[PDB]
Structure formats: structure tokens, C-alpha cells
Design a protein around this ligand. Structure first.
Ligand SMILES: C[C@@H](CNC(=O)N1CCN(C(=O)c2cc3sccc3s2)CC1)C(C)(C)C
Length: 124
């Protein structure tokens, strides 16, 4: 497909699959600072899947690369907050990250291919 816009609905569908995964439960809403009062000393830029979905639906992502950067921030925030790399919530982050990366690969490839096809005669 050379459809430059197709990534948006593909990302909506992938978010729907992530929200059905039990492994997304800790990441579906902004972290609670009452639950974790130090969290904001450790994490500079909170991120969660509801914020990603709302940014997509507002039309505030220009490309799937920008969505992918925010989803990867969810996972890096979990790796930087974990006291152990054996811990439950970090362990759920690693499985969810593997599932996300498996599915986002084709979305990025198709988008970047579509942009290249659009510019195939950009100089001419
Ligand atoms: C579910 C809530 C938000 N989410 C939430 O509490 N966390 C998920 C993010 N987070 C981590 O990534 C952690 C990494 C590790 S590994 C061992 C402990 C931890 S905690 C901190 C805790 C709600 C409902 C929105 C209030």
C-alpha cells in the first residue's frame, strides 16, 4: 500500500489490542503519585496508553514514528522505575514491549515506503 494516511487506523487498532492485553493494565492511565510519591523525582516525562490514544485521536501525531517514540517512553519509564529486573510490573512491560514491536514494524515500514513513493519524482 502507498497510502500515506493508513498508519493512523493501524495504530488505533494496535492500541485496541494493547488495551485487551492484561499486561497493559499498569500502563493504561497516568501513574498515581499518591501510590508512588518518589515517581516524579525518577521520571522526567510520564507517559501512558490513554495519553497516546488521546494524542492520536486529537490529530497531534504527524507520523507513526512520533507515536512509537511515546510508546517506547512508557517502557523506558518502567525500566528506570523498577527496583529489580525480575519485578511483576517491569516483567509485564517487557512482554507488552515485545508484542508492540512485533506489530509496529509493518506500520513503520509501510508509512516510510509510502512517503518515499510520494517523493519518487520530488526533484523532477
Ligand atoms: C495502575 C496505576 C498506574 N500505574 C502504576 O501504578 N504503575 C505502573 C508504572 N510503574 C512502573 O512501571 C513500575 C515499575 C516496576 S517493577 C516493580 C514495581 C514497579 S512500578 C509504576 C506503577 C493507576 C490505575 C493509573 C493509578
Amino acid at each position: 500500500s502507498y497510502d500515506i494516511q493508513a498508519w493512523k487506523k493501524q495504530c488505533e487498532e494496535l492500541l485496541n489490542l494493547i488495551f485487551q492485553c492484561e499486561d497493559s493494565e499498569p500502563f493504561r492511565q497516568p501513574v498515581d503519585l499518591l501510590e508512588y510519591p518518589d515517581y516524579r523525582d525518577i521520571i522526567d516525562t510520564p507517559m501512558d496508553f490513554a495519553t497516546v490514544r488521546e494524542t492520536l485521536e486529537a490529530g497531534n501525531y504527524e507520523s507513526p514514528m512520533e507515536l512509537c517514540k511515546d510508546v517506547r517512553l512508557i517502557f523506558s519509564n518502567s525500566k528506570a522505575y523498577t527496583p529489580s529486573k525480575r519485578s511483576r510490573i517491569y516483567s509485564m512491560s517487557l512482554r507488552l514491549s515485545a508484542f508492540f514491536e512485533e506489530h509496529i514494524s509493518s506500520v513503520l515500514s509501510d508509512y516510510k515506503s509510502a512517503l518515499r513513493f510520494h517523493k519518487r519524482n520530488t526533484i523532477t
